Amino acid sequence: AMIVKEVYETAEKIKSMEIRGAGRIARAAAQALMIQAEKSKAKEPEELWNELKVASKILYNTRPTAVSLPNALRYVMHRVKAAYLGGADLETLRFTAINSAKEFIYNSEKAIERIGEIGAKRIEDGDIIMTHSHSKAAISVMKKAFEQGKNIKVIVTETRPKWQGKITAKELASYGIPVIYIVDSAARHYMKMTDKVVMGADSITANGAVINKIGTSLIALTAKEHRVWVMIAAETYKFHPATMLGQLVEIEMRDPTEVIPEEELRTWPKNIEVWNPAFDVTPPEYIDVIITERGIIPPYAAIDILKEEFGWALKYKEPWED
Amino acid sequence: AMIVKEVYETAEKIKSMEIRGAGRIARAAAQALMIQAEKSKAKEPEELWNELKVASKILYNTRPTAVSLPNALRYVMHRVKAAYLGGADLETLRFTAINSAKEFIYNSEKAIERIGEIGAKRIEDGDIIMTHSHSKAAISVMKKAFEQGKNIKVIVTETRPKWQGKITAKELASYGIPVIYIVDSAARHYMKMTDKVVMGADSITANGAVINKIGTSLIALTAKEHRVWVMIAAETYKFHPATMLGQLVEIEMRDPTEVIPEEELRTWPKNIEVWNPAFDVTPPEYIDVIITERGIIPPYAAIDILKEEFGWALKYKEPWED
Amino acid sequence: AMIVKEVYETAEKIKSMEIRGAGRIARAAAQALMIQAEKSKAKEPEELWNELKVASKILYNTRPTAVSLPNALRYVMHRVKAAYLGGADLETLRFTAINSAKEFIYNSEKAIERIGEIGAKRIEDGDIIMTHSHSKAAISVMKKAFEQGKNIKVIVTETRPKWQGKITAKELASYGIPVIYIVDSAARHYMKMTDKVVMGADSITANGAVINKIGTSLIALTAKEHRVWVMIAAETYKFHPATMLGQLVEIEMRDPTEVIPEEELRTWPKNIEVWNPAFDVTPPEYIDVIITERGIIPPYAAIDILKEEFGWALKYKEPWED
Amino acid sequence: AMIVKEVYETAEKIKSMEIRGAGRIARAAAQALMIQAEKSKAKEPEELWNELKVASKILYNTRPTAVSLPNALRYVMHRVKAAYLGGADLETLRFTAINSAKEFIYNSEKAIERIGEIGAKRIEDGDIIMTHSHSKAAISVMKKAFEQGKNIKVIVTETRPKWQGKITAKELASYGIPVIYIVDSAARHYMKMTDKVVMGADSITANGAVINKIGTSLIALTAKEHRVWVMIAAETYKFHPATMLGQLVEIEMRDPTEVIPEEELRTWPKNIEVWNPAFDVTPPEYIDVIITERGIIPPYAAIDILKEEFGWALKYKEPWED
Amino acid sequence: AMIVKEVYETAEKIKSMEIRGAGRIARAAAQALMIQAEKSKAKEPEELWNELKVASKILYNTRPTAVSLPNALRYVMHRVKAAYLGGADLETLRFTAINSAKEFIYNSEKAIERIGEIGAKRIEDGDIIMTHSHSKAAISVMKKAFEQGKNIKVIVTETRPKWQGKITAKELASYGIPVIYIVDSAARHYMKMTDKVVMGADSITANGAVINKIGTSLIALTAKEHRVWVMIAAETYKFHPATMLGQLVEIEMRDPTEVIPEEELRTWPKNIEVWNPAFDVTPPEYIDVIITERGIIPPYAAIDILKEEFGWALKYKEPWED
Amino acid sequence: AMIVKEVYETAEKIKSMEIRGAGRIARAAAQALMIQAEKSKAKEPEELWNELKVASKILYNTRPTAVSLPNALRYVMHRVKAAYLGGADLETLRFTAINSAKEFIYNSEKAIERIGEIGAKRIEDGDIIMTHSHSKAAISVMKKAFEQGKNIKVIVTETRPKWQGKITAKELASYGIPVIYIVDSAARHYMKMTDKVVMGADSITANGAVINKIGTSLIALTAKEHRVWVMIAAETYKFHPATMLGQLVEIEMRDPTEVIPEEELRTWPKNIEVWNPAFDVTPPEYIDVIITERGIIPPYAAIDILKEEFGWALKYKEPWED
Ligand SMILES: O=P(O)(O)OC[C@H]1O[C@H](OP(=O)(O)O)[C@H](O)[C@@H]1O
Ligand SMILES: O=P(O)(O)OC[C@H]1O[C@H](OP(=O)(O)O)[C@H](O)[C@@H]1O
Ligand SMILES: O=P(O)(O)OC[C@H]1O[C@H](OP(=O)(O)O)[C@H](O)[C@@H]1O
Ligand SMILES: O=P(O)(O)OC[C@H]1O[C@H](OP(=O)(O)O)[C@H](O)[C@@H]1O
Ligand SMILES: O=P(O)(O)OC[C@H]1O[C@H](OP(=O)(O)O)[C@H](O)[C@@H]1O
Ligand SMILES: O=P(O)(O)OC[C@H]1O[C@H](OP(=O)(O)O)[C@H](O)[C@@H]1O
Ligand SMILES: [Cl-]
Ligand SMILES: [Cl-]
Ligand SMILES: [K+]
Ligand SMILES: [K+]
Ligand SMILES: [K+]
Ligand SMILES: [K+]
Ligand SMILES: [K+]
Ligand SMILES: [K+]
C-alpha cells in the first residue's frame, strides 16, 4: 500500500505524545485518513480501500488505552466500508473518507463546546475546583463557568511523569482564571477546601469505570471520602464498545525514561525497575456524574450510551480488517 | 551570646534540607548543642547556660513540623537546666550538655535498630512492600526483613517535590533489595499487588494521627481501602507532647521553587500560585500499628507513649525559655 | 392580561404553604389554569393564549424546588401551545387547556393510588416503617399495606419547622394505623427497630438524587448505616428534566419567622441569623428504590424516566415563554 | 386432568433437588411440557390446553425462588396461549408447545456458552477465582478462561448444607483446572489472595439485587471489603419481572433434615430449631457486573433487561391461569 | 429522716429540668448535700450520716442518664463515709461533707475553664463550628477561641424538644460570636460548610461511647461522613465507672407533653404514642477527640480515665447505701 | 527425662482435639505439669526441673494458635523457675509446680464465671444473640443472662469443619435456652434479626485483633455492617505477649481429612487441594468490646492488658528453655 507520509508522521507523533489528549489524538487520526484519501494516487476503489485499511491499522497500533482513537477510525471506516461494498466508484469512495473524517472532526469540536455549557451549570460562584492532567473537555467546563462571571479558582495537580498540569495551569491562567498548582501527593491535603473535582477520560467502560491519566483514581477516592463531587467531562466517543462484550482495557506502559531521564537512569543499579503506567481505573462508585455532549448521566448509564450508539457494530469485524 | 559557627551551619543545613529526615535533624540539633558546649569560651555557668538557651532557640526556629527536633533539644536542655538550677559549676554544666547530647544520639541509633527488629517480624517471605519518602526507621524494617532471608520487593514512590524516593530506591538497592520505582500518582494502581505499607513519621499526635511527608495520607487511605496493612515506624521522640494539651501541629510550607525551578517559575503568569506543603496528616483510622523501639501499638495508644514519657514536662516552660 | 382571581389566590396559597405537598401543588397549578380557561372572556385565541402564558408565569414563580409544579404547567401548556400554533380557534384552545388540566389531575390521582399498590408489596407483616414530612405518595404505600391486613406501625418524625409530622400522625391514625411520634433528632436512635423507611420526593435529578423535605438526607444516611431499606415514593412528574442538561435544583430558603416566631425573633441579638432551607439533597447511594406509578426503579434509572418522558422538550423553550 | 408421569416425576425431582441449578430446572420444566404435548391423547385443542395449564401449575409449585422456572413456563405458555386463543387446531397447538419448549432449551444452552465467552474475557492469566455453590453459568466462564490458556486456580467453597462445592470442585478439576476447596467460613480468610469472585444467580430483581445460594451475600460483602471484583454469570431468564411491580422474592426454607440428618435430629431437644434458608439476597452495591448472554451490565441495569424483555407481560395474568 | 427543704427543692428542679446541664446538675447536688450538712440539727454523727445518705438517695433518684450526678454524690459521700467509719465526731463529719462538696464545685468550675483553654487550641481562625444542645463545656471552648481573637461562627442546632439551642444561640451571641440557628434536620445540609463539631456529654462509657442530648449521634454520623472533626468537651466526672463492669447506661424517657403540649396532646387519638428519649448514644468510631481537664484523648482512652480515677470504688457499694 | 504418661496423653488429646477450647486446653496443660510434679521420682531439684522443662516443651508443641496454652505453661514455669534458681529443695520445687498449676486452674474457672456476670449486663431482655464455635467464656455470658430471667434466644452457627456448633446448641438447650441452628453461610441473612454477637477468643494481639475459630471475622464483618454489637468474651490469658514485640500469630492448618473424610478424599482428583485453617483474624474495627474478668475494654486497650500483665517477661527467655 502507498501510504502517505502524513499518516506515518501522525502515527509517530501520537506514539511519542507530541500529539496527546484523547480527543485530539482521535481528531488527528481522522485527519490522517482524510489526507490519505485526498492525496491517494490510487486509480481503482479496491486500491484506495486497501490504503485506508492499512492506514487505519497503522494509526490504531500507536497507543492502546484511549478508545477515542479507534472510535474515530471506526466512524470513518464504517462509512467508507459501506460505500465500498455498495459499489462506490473511486471518487465517491474518496469523498466518503474525506467527508466522514471532516464530520468526526467537526462533531468532536461541537461536543467539547456543549460539554462546557452543560458542565458549567454545575459549577457555582466561589467554587474551588480540582482537576488532573490536561483534558480539553474538563477545561471547557472551567472556562465556560468563568465566562459566565462565576469567581472560581482551579487547583491543578502536577500530573507526573509528563507534567501535564503545567499545560493546564498555563492554559487556564491565560483565560484569566486564578490557578493553584500542587504536586499530585497534596491532593488529599487540599480536598477539604475543594468544592468540585472535574476531570476528563480516555475510556469509559460498560460498567461505568473511567480510565484516565495515572492518578485520577486517587483523587476520585479522596473526593468521595470528603463528599466532594467528582464530574467526568467526556465525549460519547470516549465510551468503549468492546467492554460490553467483556473486553478489558489495556493500560499503556510507557518508556521508563519518561520518569527518570536516560542520563540519570543508566547510572542506577540493575535491581531497580521503573514502572510507568499512563492510566489508572476509577470505579464508578467514586464518580458522581459523566457529562457528555448529550447530557448528564450517572456512571451506571454508560452502558446506555454504548448500547444505543455503538452496540450495532459489535456483530461485525473492525471495518479496517480483512 | 557567643554562638559557635557549627550551630549556625547546622541551623542553615536543616533549613535548606541539606540535612533531613526527622531523626537525623534531631541528632544534628543535639550534636550542635554538644559542640556549643565543647567549644564555649564562657567562664561562668550563667554564660554557658545563656549560650545553650540561645543555641536551642536558633535550632528550634529552623523547621517546625517534625517534633523530633524540639524533643531532642528538650532531652538535652531539661538536664542542662536542672544541673544549672541545682548550682552546677561551669565544667559540670558543660559536661551535662555534652553527655546528654551523646545519650540522645546513641539512644536514637539504638531505637532505630530495634524498630527494625520489631517491624521485620511483621514482614513475611514473598511480601511486596510499598513505602513513601525516605525514612531511616522504615528502611530499618525493610533491611532487617531482607537480612533474615525473606524475599521481598519494595515499591518506592517518587515523593515529589524533593524526589526523596530516589534516595530510598538507591539505598534499598544498595543492600540487595529489588526495588520498583513509581510516581506518587500510581500508588492506588499498585495497591492491589502490595502486601504491606511501611512509612515513617515526623510527628505523632495524642489522638493517634501521623504527620509525615506530603502524600502519606493518600497512600494510607487507599491501603485501608484495599485492606493492606499500614505500619508506621517511629521512635518515641516522634510523639508530640504539646498535642496532649490541644496544640495543632504546624504544616511547614516550603519555597515554591522546590516545585517549579526559579528559571521556569519567573516566566509564569502572576495568577498562578504554587503551594508546597511538606507534610500531610493521616488519621489514625488508616494506620494499623505504630512500631516504636518499645513495641507495637495501635495508633490510639500514642497518648500512652506521651503520658508516660513526656506529660511531666507540660507543667513547665520550654527548658530553653527565660 | 385579565387574570382571574383564582389564579392569584392559588399562587398566594402555594407561596404561603396554605396548599403544600409537591403533588397537591401541581394539581392546584393545573386547576388554576383550568379556571383561567373556563372563565376567560377572551374573544380571540391570541387573547386566551396570552392569559394562559401569564397565568403560567404567575404559577411558576411561587415555589422553586418541587419540579412537580412546572411539570404540571408544561403538561397543560405544551398542549395548549401546540393547539394554538396549529391554528385552533377560541373554543378549541379553551377545551385543550381545560382538558389537558383535567388529564393531569386525573393521572396524578391514579399515579398515587398505583404507587400505593406497588410499594405496599414491599411492606411485610409486622413491619415498623419510618417516614418523614407528609407525602401523599408515601402515605398511599402505608395505607394500602394496612388495608391488605399487614400489622404495621409507623414512626412519624415531627418535621420541623412546619410540624408536617403532626399532619402525618393524625392522617395515619385516622386510617387505624398505630403511630409513634418522635422528634427529628431521634431518627438514629430508633433506626435499630425500624424495618423500612418510606419517604416522598419534590424533585429527582438525572443522577438519581432526591430532593425532599429538610432532614430527608439524614434519615436516609442513618438508614443506610443500619441497612434499612430506603424507599422513595414518587410520581414520574417528580422527575426533573433540566437536570439532564446540567441544571442545579434551587433549594428554597423560607422565612426565618417560620422557625422562630416574629414576636420572639425580634428580641434576639442581631449577630444571630436563622437559616431555613425547606429541602435537602439525598444522594442516590442512600436510596434503595424509587417507586413510580410505572414500577420500582433503582435511583440510577432516574435518567431513563427523564429521557423517555421529558427529553424531547429540552430543545424547546418553556411553553409559556415569548 | 390427564397428566403424563414425566410431569410428575420432573416435579418430584425438582422438589427433592435430584434435579437442581436454576437453568437446569428451567430446562427440565420446558422438557416436561414438551413431553406432555408429545404424549397427550387429547382429541380437541381445549383438552390439550387444559393439560398444559395443569402441568404448568404442577411444575410452578415445586420450588419458588429461582425465577428461571416460571420464566421457562411462561416462554412456552405465552406462545401456547396465543395459538389456542387464535384458533389453532389440535396439531398446531401441540407443535407450538413442543417447539416453544425446544426453543427455550436451545436458547438456554447457547446463553450459557455465550456467558462463558463474554465472562472469560474478564479473567486474566494467573487469576485466583473464588466461586460458591455450583452454577453452570459461572463454570462456563471459568472453563472457557482455561481453554483460552489462562492459568487460573479456583477457590471453591463447600456450600453447606447440600455440599454443592464438591460438585463444583470435581467438575472444574476434570477440565484441568486446579482447585482449592475450603469451608464457607474461610471465604474472608482467603479473600486477600483472590483476584475475582464469579458466582451465579437464581433471581435478579428490578433494583439490581441478586438472589443466589445461601452465603453468596457474605462472599460478596467481604469481596467488596477487599476490592475484589464480584461478577455474577446469569442468563436473561434469571431476571425477575414481578419485582418491577414491587413483588418480594420468596426465599425457600428447606427441610431441616438436610442440615442435621433425621437420625441425629430426632435425638435433639425440642428447644433447638434448625432453620434452612436455601438462598440469600446480595444487594447491588456488592456486585460489580452481571454477565448475561447479551453483554456485561452494571446491576442497576437489571431494570433495562426487565423492561425490554419482560415488562409487556405484566398487564396479563400468568399464561397458565384460567 | 430530717431532710432540709433545699434537698427536696433541688431534686424537684433537677427533675423538672428547671436546673439542667450535666455539670450544673452535679454542682447542684453537691450544694444540696452541703446545705443539708450546714443546717442539720443532728446531735450525733450517726444521725448526720443517716441524713446525708437519705439526701443522697433523694438526689440520685432524680434523673438517671448523666453520670455527673452520682459522681458528685460519690465525691462527697466516699469522703463522708470514710470519716464517719474512722470515728469522726459530729463537727468533723459536718465539715467533711461541706468541704468535700465545696471541692467538687470548685474543681468543676476549674475543669470547665481548663477544657476551654485546651479545646480552644483546636479551633482555628475562620472556623465554622457546629454544636448541639447547650453544654457549658463546649461553650467554654468556643468562648475562649473567640477571646483569643479567632474569627469563628457557630451553627447552633435547635435541639428539640426543649429548644436548648435557643439558650446556646443567645449565650454565644452575648459574648460577641456570630451564630447561625438551624433546625436539627438541617445538620447534614450544613455539614459541607462546617469545619468542626463541638458538643458536650452526659456520660462517657468504658468503650468510648458518648451519651449526650438526643440527636448528637446523628450530627456525629454525618460529620464523620464529611470528614469534619467531632470534638467532645467533657470533664472527668462525665466518665461512667459502672460501665467498666458491663453496666448499660439508662436512657431517660421524658414526659410526652414536652414534645406535644398537654392541650394539643389530649385531642389526639389513642393510637398515636409520643416517645421522648432525652439522649442518644454516639459510638466511638464517630468521635475524634474527647477534651477533658486533663488533656485531649481518643475516645478509646475513656477506659484509662475510668481505671486511674474511678476503678478503686467498684469493689464497694455506693457510699450512700446501708 | 522420665515423663509420666499423663503428659503424653494430654499432649495427644490436645493435638487430636479430643480436648479443645482455648481455656480448657490451658487448664489441661497446667494439669499435666501438676501430674508430672506429683508423680515424679526425681531425688534432686535439678532432676524435677529438667522434667518440667521437657513436659512443658512437649505441651507447647501441640497446637500453636491459642496463646492460652503457653500462657498457662508460663504461669507455672515462671514460678517453678524462680524457685529453682533461688535454691529451692525438691519438695519446695514440687509444691511450687503443683500449687502454681492449681492457682492457674482455679483463676481460669473464676475468670470465666466473672466474664459471665460482666457480659450478661450487656445482654437485654428479648435479645437475639448470635454466636459462633463453642466458647465457654461466651456461653458463660449467655447462660448468666438467662439465669437473670432475660428472655433470650441464641442463634448457633454450625462451625464447620468440626461442627462445634452442635456442641453449643445442645449445651445451651440443656440450660433451657431456646436455640436456632443455622449453617455458617446463613450468618448474613439472619444478622438483621440479631441484637448482639457474643464470641470467644484464642489469641488477642497487641493491636486489638482477635484470632478465633474460622469464620469469626465474617460474622464480625457483617455484624459491623448491620450495626450489631460484637462482643468477645476472653480471659486475660487469651492476650498474646509476643505480639507486643512484632510477632505474628501462626494460624494452625489442620488435616484436610477433617474437612473431607479420608474415604471420600482419596477418590478426588489430584488437582484439588483441601485447605483447612482452624482460625482467622478479626480486625479491631469490627469489635465493640472485649469482656475480660477485669472488665469491659475497647479492643485497642488490649496493649494495656499486655503491658500490665505480660510485658515484664519479654526481656527473658521462655521459662522452659535452656
Ligand atoms: O480528550 P481530553 O478531554 O483532551 O483528554 C482526556 C484525557 O486524555 C489524556 O491522556 P494523554 O495525555 O493523551 O495520555 C489525559 O489523560 C486526559 O484526561
Ligand atoms: O526519622 P526518619 O524515619 O528518617 O524520617 C521520618 C520522616 O521525616 C522526613 O521528613 P523530611 O524529608 O525531613 O521533610 C520524611 O517525611 C520521613 O518520613
Ligand atoms: O407530593 P407528595 O408525595 O404529597 O409530597 C412530596 C414532598 O413534598 C413536600 O414538600 P412541601 O410540604 O410542599 O414543602 C414534602 O417534602 C413531601 O415529602
Ligand atoms: O443456573 P446455574 O448457573 O447453574 O445456577 C444458579 C444457581 O442456582 C442454584 O440453586 P439450587 O442448587 O437449584 O438451589 C445455585 O444457587 C446456583 O448458583
Ligand atoms: O455539662 P454540660 O457541658 O453543660 O452539658 C452536657 C450535656 O448535658 C445536657 O443534658 P440535659 O439538658 O441536662 O438533659 C446536654 O445533653 C448537654 O450536652
Ligand atoms: O476458651 P473458650 O472460651 O472455651 O473458647 C475460645 C475459642 O477456642 C476454640 O478453639 P478450638 O475449638 O480449640 O480450635 C474456639 O475458637 C473458641 O471460640
Ligand atoms: Cl426481594
Ligand atoms: Cl451503654
Ligand atoms: K471539600
Ligand atoms: K493488596
Ligand atoms: K433496623
Ligand atoms: K485480593
Ligand atoms: K466541611
Ligand atoms: K440486627
Numbering used by the authors:
A (entry chain B), B (entry chain B), C (entry chain C), D (entry chain A), E (entry chain A), F (entry chain C): 3 to 324
Give the published text.
In summary, our study demonstrates that PH0208 protein would function as a purine nucleotide dependent R15Pi enzyme and not as a homologue of the regulatory subunit of eIF2B. In NMP degradation pathway, R15Pi catalyzes the conversion of ribose-1,5-bisphosphate (R15P, substrate) into ribulose-1,5-bisphosphate (RuBP, product) in an adenosine 5′-monophosphate (AMP)-dependent manner. AMP acts as an activator of R15Pi and in its absence the enzymatic activity has been found to decline dramatically. Monomer of PH0208 protein consists of an N-terminal α-helical domain (residues 1–122) and a C-terminal α-β-α sandwich domain (residues 123–324).
In order to verify the role of the catalytic residues in PH0208 protein, the residue Cys135 was mutated to serine. The mutation led to the formation of a catalytically inactive protein which lost the ability to convert the substrate into product and thus, held the substrate in the active site pocket. The substrate molecule (R15P) binds to the active site of PH0208-C135S in a manner similar to that of the wild type (WT) protein. Therefore, binding affinity was studied using the mutant proteins, PH0208-C135S and PH0208-D204N in which case the heat change would be solely due to ligand binding. The analysis shows that both PH0208-C135S and PH0208-D204N proteins bind to R15P with high affinity with equilibrium dissociation constants (Kd) of 13.8 and 10 μM, respectively. On the contrary, the PH0208-C135S and PH0208-D204N bind the product (RuBP) with negative ∆H value for the binding peaks indicating an exothermic reaction. The mutants formed strong interactions with RuBP with Kd values of 7.5 and 7.2 μM, respectively, which corresponds to the binding affinity of the substrate. The residues Cys135 and Asp204, known to be absolutely conserved in R15Pi enzyme and essential for the catalysis of R15P (substrate) to RuBP (product) are also conserved in PH0208 protein. Mutation of these two residues in PH0208 protein led to the inhibition of the isomerization of the substrate into product.
